[PDB]
Amino acid sequence: AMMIGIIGAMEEEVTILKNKLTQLSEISVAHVKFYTGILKDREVVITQSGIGKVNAAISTTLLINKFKPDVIINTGSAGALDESLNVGDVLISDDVKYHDADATAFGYEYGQIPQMPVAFQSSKPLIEKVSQVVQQQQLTAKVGLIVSGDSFIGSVEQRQKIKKAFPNAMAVEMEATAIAQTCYQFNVPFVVVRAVSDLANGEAEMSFEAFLEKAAVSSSQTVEALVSQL
Amino acid sequence: AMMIGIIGAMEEEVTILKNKLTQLSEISVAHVKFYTGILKDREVVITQSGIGKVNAAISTTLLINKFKPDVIINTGSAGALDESLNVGDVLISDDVKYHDADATAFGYEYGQIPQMPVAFQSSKPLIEKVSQVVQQQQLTAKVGLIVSGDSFIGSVEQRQKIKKAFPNAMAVEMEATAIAQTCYQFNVPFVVVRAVSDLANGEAEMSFEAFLEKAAVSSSQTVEALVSQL
Numbered sequence A, B: 001a002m003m004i005g006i007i008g009a010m011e012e013e014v015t016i017l018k019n020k021l022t023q024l025s026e027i028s029v030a031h032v033k034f035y036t037g038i039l040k041d042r043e044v045v046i047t048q049s050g051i052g053k054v055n056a057a058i059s060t061t062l063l064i065n066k067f068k069p070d071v072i073i074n075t076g077s078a079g080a081l082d083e084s085l086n087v088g089d090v091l092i093s094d095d096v097k098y099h100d101a102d103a104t105a106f107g108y109e110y111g112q113i114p115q116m117p118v119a120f121q122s123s124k125p126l127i128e129k130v131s132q133v134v135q136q137q138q139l140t141a142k143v144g145l146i147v148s149g150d151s152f153i154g155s156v157e158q159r160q161k162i163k164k165a166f167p168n169a170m171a172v173e174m175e176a177t178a179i180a181q182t183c184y185q186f187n188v189p190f191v192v193v194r195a196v197s198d199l200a201n202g203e204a205e206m207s208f209e210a211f212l213e214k215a216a217v218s219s220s221q222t223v224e225a226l227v228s229q230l
């Protein structure tokens, strides 16, 4: 009837939710770790994907192909590009695009992979649902464009390059768009529910280390509450 | 006993080999097209992956997970970084690395994905074998480092950035390293056998259009001959 896939890159980003599962089983294929079980009376498969585009694509492709999920939720951290955001704030995806893909030589839009869409769209019913969830959890949050690349944005120079190219980008991280592209290829609805760990600036690396735990808590709290309503 | 996977991005890059198969069947999963059959008395599954890192990862992950290949060969075109190379020259991978992955903020080597290897290694027995093949086919060829990214290198500026970062890089293209990373995760031996379609410079886009057919012919001729010896 209903199966919910949850993907995060790092152990620290999936451990809270994993420890809340009942009926837990662990499965391993390639470097991907899957934890099947029940969360808030819902079937879920939590996936630790590894970092970056390819690890995310691999993980999402097995998750879909082995567990046939009805929806996929991507959690984890991200660097804030919107100056009004603070560490710990929840980030909800509305569209997602690559900020490091340049095939403009062929006439494609900057960020667009040849023969793919310029952007990928989160499921609108999921955006609406998690929007209700964050408010009732009284967790500061924001919905917006999230951009992905295979680089850690830890300098103002990198940050300005992205801001100039995607003025409306709200946050930046490494897997969301890869997961979204994979979901597009299999036509599976998705939504990203991450949290700010840093401001993607010259202190980003230090901030990331300082707030990794905080971000995992707010994003996990939101994901758990969202799952309970699906 | 022996199953050979062959991956290329574009229809034009896989059509020659596809039309040489006997026992042909076509299978479709997501946007991936698979053609199973026999080539030079060898079982093979030819895969049209689509362009870029994520499309390549998705395609390689199903190919491995659905067909259990013993070896994987990546074919297609690439831009030459070694000035001695000419369009149509065959390119054989020795290691492969991403030229656009920057997680140096955490202390990783430029081009290295967090918690992955700096590079991925082609199967040495495959390198040796295809080296014999290109000579006996009397096709100009070269073995070396190939670098990948989610961008088309069509300007001297982009080209210099790569050359400075990877002085020994021989060629650049979009999927090889993603395929290699996927093969690393499943521990499947691989080798890249592509051909020069352009010089990755200000004429790269035009050169690509002009020599796409030539590159498909030399790379396909080499792949077909290699398969016959495996």
Ligand SMILES: Nc1ncnc2c([C@@H]3O[C@H](CO)[C@@H](O)[C@H]3O)n[nH]c12
Pocket: A009, A051, A052, A076, A077, A078, A079, A080, A151, A152, A153, A154, A172, A173, A174, A175, A197, A198, A199, A200, A201, A204, A208, B103, B114
């Ligand atoms: N400022 C930033 N830039 C890029 N990625 C991240 C991240 C996320 O945390 C990991 C950083 O390597 C990775 O999974 C990515 O998605 N947090 N902050 C980031």
Ligand SMILES: Nc1ncnc2c([C@@H]3O[C@H](CO)[C@@H](O)[C@H]3O)n[nH]c12
Pocket: A103, A114, B009, B051, B052, B076, B077, B078, B079, B080, B151, B152, B153, B154, B172, B173, B174, B175, B197, B198, B199, B200, B201, B204, B208
């Ligand atoms: N100079 C160049 N830069 C990047 N990719 C390519 C290619 C390859 O051809 C496609 C160009 O979009 C893609 O599959 C890529 O792997 N040929 N020449 C290239």
